[PDB]
Amino acid sequence: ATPAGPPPKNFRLPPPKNWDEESESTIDKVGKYFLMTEMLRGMYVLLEQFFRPPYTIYYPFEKGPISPRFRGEHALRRYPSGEERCIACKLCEAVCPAQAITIEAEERADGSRRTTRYDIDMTKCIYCGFCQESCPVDAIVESPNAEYATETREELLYNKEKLLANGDKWEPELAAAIRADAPYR
Template identity: 40%
Template sequence: MTDKPYEPLRPKKGPLGELLAPVAGFGVTFSSMFRPTVTEQYPRTKTPPQRRYHGRHQLNRYADGLEKCIGCELCAWACPADAIYVEGADNADLPDGGHMSPGERYGRVYQINYLRCIFCGLCIEACPTRALTMTNDYELAGPERAGMIYEKKDLLAPLAEGMLAAPHPMVEGTTDTEYYRGEVAAPTAEQLDWVRDRRPDDATLSGAERVVHGEAPPPTPSRHRLRGSATKAAVATREAATGGHVGTGSAGGRA
């Protein structure tokens, strides 16, 4: 058996290619020199990132308003930067048979330290209930280190129109399996009566009642999104009003 000389798979360059090889690396530079310059008008005009962009996290809800997080802490174990802290609790400890999430447990404490987070998405892969996802919101800067630790109230998805605020019982006759399969599409009359008896001033009662009576479509879970474009003056005003964060809401202006 004779050893054949090594022959590279890459085709050999011709005489012209060999001549231009020393300056071939400048091809991208030269081609960019003749393109028009585009200036991003951020923050007055915001360009949404791609759909699969890894932005800030969100804790999702089911269609009846219960939380998807079951406090299993798998996201915290999967995080390579140790940026997530979770404390679970039992739904059985809630009064009158109320639930924060389907099943036995829920996430009582949920924190993400965005000073550590590297936005790798491993926590998303580890979540067994799709409770944790990532949005396209990239505006996470702040003036204080403490404000970069997002609490559960900052991460939880906003209640969509027609959802019923937790705690309340699960849909009658269901287990957590029906929730995981997406078979729960809206709150029920029994859940509505339970909340009305215990929290008659709950702001979500009116919207849920319209859904139960067929006067409104079933709720569609919502998500945190990139805040809309604004003028420079409006951005400065909101920053001053919220302690330096761009946006509205509690905990340093996080939406």
């Protein structure tokens, strides 16, 4: 229990004190018991909080704070020209801790290395950002969006069409979040 060597100085407690030896007067002792002084003090604390401002925000009219690093709904991004950023490296499919990404690829009609299938199973994804960290072209990113609850589970099986549409809609946020945090990446 104690470390090896001599006992720590004053580790042994002094002997217990009898009722007779208690250094506290009877009137104080009887008064606290019958008047419940510490319970009254605790109640007084609540009144102090009763007149302090509440912390509540009125969601969805107000929102809590999120950072440029926030990991939400996935999106596929473009270049300013509109070409897809994705070149089917499969780095995000390999690093994915949950095996949520499935990719197929060949040469496009113009001979470019592009995907034919890019699915993310949002009911397998653990929202960790590893794909976004592994992507060498900033193709896969997590948007700040978190309000996309769905009626059916099939609506959470994102294919390439769903993900490229998400990137088209969210691009100004995606660029702003990349703009703020890229120095730290």
